Amino acid sequence: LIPIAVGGALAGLVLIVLIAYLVGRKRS
Amino acid sequence: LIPIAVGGALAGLVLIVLIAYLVGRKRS
Amino acid sequence: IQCSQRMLSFSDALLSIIATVMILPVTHTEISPEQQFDRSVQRLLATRIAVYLMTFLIVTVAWAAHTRLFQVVGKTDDTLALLNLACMMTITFLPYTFSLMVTFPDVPLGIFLFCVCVIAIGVVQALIVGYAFHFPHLLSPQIQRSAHRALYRRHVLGIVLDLHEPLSKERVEAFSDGVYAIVATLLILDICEDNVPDPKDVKERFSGSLVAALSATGPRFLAYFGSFATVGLLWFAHHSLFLHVRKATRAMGLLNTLSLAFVGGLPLAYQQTSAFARQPRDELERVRVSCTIIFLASIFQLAMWTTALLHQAETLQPSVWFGGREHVLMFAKLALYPCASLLAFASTCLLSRFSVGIFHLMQIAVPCAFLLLRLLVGLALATLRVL
Amino acid sequence: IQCSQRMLSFSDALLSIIATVMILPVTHTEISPEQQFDRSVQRLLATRIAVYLMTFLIVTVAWAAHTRLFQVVGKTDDTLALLNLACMMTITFLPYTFSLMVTFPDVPLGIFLFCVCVIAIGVVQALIVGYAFHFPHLLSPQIQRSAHRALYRRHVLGIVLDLHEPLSKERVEAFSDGVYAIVATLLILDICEDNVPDPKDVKERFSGSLVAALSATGPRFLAYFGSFATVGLLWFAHHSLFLHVRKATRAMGLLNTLSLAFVGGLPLAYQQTSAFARQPRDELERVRVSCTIIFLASIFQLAMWTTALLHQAETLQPSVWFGGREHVLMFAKLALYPCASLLAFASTCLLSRFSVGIFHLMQIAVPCAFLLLRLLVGLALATLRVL
């Protein structure tokens, strides 16, 4: 059912947040 | 009836405001 | 360690909401059924108004205590923010508990619950005081500069467990703005909640003519227009007054509290005044009620300015002192509304049958008078200079 | 000519109220009748939620336009205050008109009325722009220092009739505080309105035992407790974040708008979660809904801070830069809620039958974690320093 799919969407959101943070760190 | 009496109470309120203003003016 | 401005602003918003909560039952009341069921409905309405006034005053007292407490405390940290949140949460219960107490005076449970709420507020404020005084750098500069701080650590605790004293001008402004904003938009909330034409409603009664269904509800829209205009102009007067204040005293705070408490009733007055009765005598009475409410609202702003004038030499900006560059304009600006409301009232006695129209005309007159106030003051002073 | 701070604060309060107005129908909804009338009630509920979201976004756009307009305009006078009041009054109609339009899409009257409201807002803002540029001393220092002001007099008019641009940090804080305060105390208003035990109610059902009547309404009190706690802690995270910002960009504003829009739904989530169903599977679904709403609310605050980190070199205070004295603490503080909400969600799949208890335990865990966050961060960093 959907619960795992919406959880995956949440995981994707946190992943884009993480990639933004890592990009900022690399830019320094 | 009361309307004139309550209007007189309103007049008394504005009168105390006026006396406060005049006291302040006199104190200067 | 960071500035505490924003947390106090948030607390003021919460306190405005909590203080004005009990107005909703009054406006959501069963306003006017025909054939005069007043003989029994007016007891309910008066009870609701009394509860509103009492709860507003209690919450204002709590807000004043909070303002003093965070006047002695200068800075804030992660812990003080959470403690303040706890204090706000416990404050939010005062209206419901007071209403429960008044509803069931014989049962001791309500009184006990009210006492519990008050004790909780006191305990949390005492915890904040202790935390602040355990870390000296958080107190205000004056307190931590002084060597008697040891006595104050117990003094403020004794307070939390006179007219010349200062209040925080910023917090007075914030709380007043919150209350004015809540009241001004008070009866658009219900319009949005329940006044959108139902498809079936228009289909049956109005045969699908949406315009007819919309026009059927004109009176409440007009009441909202009038209420918002009046409350906004009262706020404008308040804002103009307080732009010229250096320090706010406790007497000014009390007068401001009375002004706000009486301002709160305007939405009900306008709702009733547009709640047309069966015969015009009731309409004249409604106009009288609206005029007296407006006068009571504004006369206390005027009284606040006059009270501050008594110590203008220290309390006010020089520009408003006697003989100042804007003293006359300030007096006229603050006196406008009381004069118009009083004249509208008196018209009901002297020119009764035209008084409803005079009230409508006054609603249009006051805003324009405010808009041109400087020009009209200049004109009048120029004319009277050589008389 | 006086500072415009207070008028902008009042406008922000009004805008918060107007934006959050349409939440009331959602919480005042017919929450849960047994035997699953959902098959027809859920269309109504979804329509109401969609209307809420759309109206909130529209009013936020209007607020952003206002913030920019009074960013170019620096000072205020008696005329600008009244013009701003007119602008606010015309803004207040957007929710009702939008709801009317969506209610009757086929009838052109609703669309026409919405267009009328938008045109009125634009016209009033154009009047403010013209008045400001007709009197140079009111504009901000930068504009009136520049010699190209002639072009700007038309440019801003063209705007009122991109991610790197600045917003007013003060107005972002004010609007966010207004929305947070409105939402946090959202479902105590209805408790006060309709949840005081009626004397006859206790007399008949509870045989006069006021305590039994009071305990009959425990679930709504518990829902209010949880809602206020969660919203207050979210505001605490927001406040801690924004204490460390030098400048706010449009991307940060958009992320903040999303965060607030999703924050608005928490009262409904808690009301439903305490609206116990007939069987526990619905309870698990309710817990899942609450967890996802909380995660959506907080992940956007975290995203806002990360977006600001991309230009920290100019946007943030030095203390939060990479390698700063509080960078790690800030990251942990902003990441706390998303982590707890995500784990509570996942528990429903991995440890389902204990997930309701885990949600209750998380509600107690998060506040304590915030309270001790500095100490726990120090401990974890000390442990990991030599690993």
From Swiss-Prot, chains A, B:
Transmembrane segments: 1-28
Domain of life: Eukaryota
Post-translational modification as stated in the protein's UniProt record: O- and N-glycosylated; some of the 18 N-linked glycans are polylactosaminoglycans.
Subcellular locations according to the entry: Lysosome membrane; Endosome membrane; Late endosome membrane; Cell membrane
Assembly notes: Interacts with ABCB9; this interaction strongly stabilizes ABCB9 and protects ABCB9 against lysosomal degradation. Interacts with FURIN. Interacts with TMEM175; inhibiting the proton channel activity of TMEM175.
Function field: Lysosomal membrane glycoprotein which plays an important role in lysosome biogenesis, lysosomal pH regulation, autophagy and cholesterol homeostasis. Acts as an important regulator of lysosomal lumen pH regulation by acting as a direct inhibitor of the proton channel TMEM175, facilitating lysosomal acidification for optimal hydrolase activity. Also plays an important role in NK-cells cytotoxicity. Mechanistically, participates in cytotoxic granule movement to the cell surface and perforin trafficking to the lytic granule. (Microbial infection) Acts as a receptor for Lassa virus glycoprotein. Also promotes fusion of the virus with host membrane in less acidic endosomes.
Family named by the database record: Belongs to the LAMP family.
Protein name as it appears in the record: Lysosome-associated membrane glycoprotein 1
Annotated organism of origin: Homo sapiens
Native organism taxonomy: Eukaryota, Metazoa, Chordata, Craniata, Vertebrata
Coverage span on the entire protein: 383 to 410 of 417
Curated annotation (Swiss-Prot), chains C, D:
Motif extent (RxxxFSD motif 2): 171-177
First-listed, main subcellular location of the protein, grouped into a coarse class: membrane
Transmembrane segments: 5-27, 49-71, 78-99, 110-131, 169-193, 221-243, 250-271, 287-307, 328-351, 354-380
Result of altering T249A: Reduced channel activation, probably caused by decreased interaction with AKT1
Hydrophobic filter residue 2-2 (site feature) positions: L186
Known catalytic reactions: H(+)(in) = H(+)(out); K(+)(in) = K(+)(out)
Alphabetized InterPro entries for the sequence: TMEM175-like
Effect of I17N: Impaired selectivity; can conduct both K(+) and Na(+)
Documented effect of changing S11A: Impaired potassium channel activity
Listed result of changing T185V: Abolished proton and potassium channel activity
UniProt record similarity statement: Belongs to the TMEM175 family.
Protein name stated in the entry: Endosomal/lysosomal proton channel TMEM175
Species annotation: Homo sapiens (Human)
Encoding gene, per UniProt annotation: TMEM175
